[PDB]
Amino acid sequence: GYFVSIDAHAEECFFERVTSGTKMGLIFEVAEGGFLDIDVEITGPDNKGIYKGDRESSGKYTFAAHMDGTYKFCFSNRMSTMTPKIVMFTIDIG
Amino acid sequence: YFVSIDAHAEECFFERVTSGTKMGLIFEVAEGGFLDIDVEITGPDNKGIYKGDRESSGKYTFAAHMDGTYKFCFSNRMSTMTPKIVMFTIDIG
């Protein structure tokens, strides 16, 4: 399955280029381990805050591109964790 | 787009493209310091494709050497009392 490892006080981002009107879906779940939640942010090509979620253990967020361009999906670890947070996720386009 | 870059800060923008796609950058420093900025464009393999030091403006086109996300970064390495303001456009072919 798809996942990302996020070190303490770090952000890991993923990118998709899509056309206006395209459905985009994020699903995520923090993996098994010592940590329960993650910060998530989705931003559009002109820095629109599409989604911002703090301290979420899991989530589903579906939206439609409002313009052509690159969309940014970011996971942030805001704590001084001794090991990185692991988060399972998928980004579905169309 | 206008972006403010504080003293000793960096601001990056990202475009995901396919190999061979043309990518245009136009930029001009509008305000701050000596009206100069450092520019770095880096590919998804961490291969830098453009580095400009202390540039006041530029217009360039690049061809992506591989699929993935390219990072366009503006860095202000002066201890300016004001931030640099850069006006820029990234065009993707």
Shape of chain A: elongated
First CA to last CA of chain A: what distance? 20 Å
Residues in helix, % of chain A:
under 10%
Number of domains of chain A: 1
Secondary structure: number of strands of chain A: 8
Radius of gyration of chain A: 13 Å
Q: What is the beta-strand fraction of chain A?
A: over 45%
Largest interface: A-B, 8 and 7 residues
Q: Largest sheet of chain A, order of strands side by side?
A: 1-8-3-6
Sequence-ordered SSE layout with sheet pairings:
Two copies of one chain form a homodimer.
Chain A: E1 3-6, E2 10-18, E3 23-30, E4 38-43, E5 49-56, E6 58-64, E7 69-77, E8 85-93
Antiparallel strand pairs in A: 1-8, 2-7, 3-6, 3-8, 4-5, 4-7
Structural account:
The structure is a homodimer. Chain A is an all-beta fold and 94 residues long. Chain A has no helices and eight strands. In chain A, the strands form two sheets. Chain A has a four-stranded antiparallel beta sheet with strand order 1-8-3-6, with no helix packed on it. A four-stranded antiparallel beta sheet of chain A has the order 2-7-4-5, with no helix packed on it. At the A-B interface, strand 2 and strand 7 of A face strand 2 of B. Chain A: Keywords: Coiled coil, Cytoplasmic vesicle, Endoplasmic reticulum, ER-Golgi transport, Golgi apparatus, Membrane, Protein transport, Signal, Transmembrane, Transmembrane helix, Transport. Chain A: This is Transmembrane emp24 domain-containing protein 2. Chain A: It is found in: Cytoplasmic vesicle membrane; Cytoplasmic vesicle, COPI-coated vesicle membrane; Golgi apparatus, cis-Golgi network membrane; Golgi apparatus, Golgi stack membrane.
